[PDB]
Amino acid sequence: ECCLICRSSTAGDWVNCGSCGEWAHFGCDRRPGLGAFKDYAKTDGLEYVCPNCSV
């Protein structure tokens, strides 16, 4: 349903975690090195793995 980080479902750019399958606003994940939504949204774009699933 809602953002695994902020727990709202407001409008924005969303990524699905490839580990747990939950969704997150890309803008709520502030980890260094993540890059831009663009690199995820395209075909064969990077895989998103949420902060908890990463390690």
Binding site: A11, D13, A41, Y48
Partner: peptide, 8 residues
Amino acid sequence: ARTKQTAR
């Protein structure tokens, strides 16, 4: 990744 853009 699987993504979406929403507006609600």
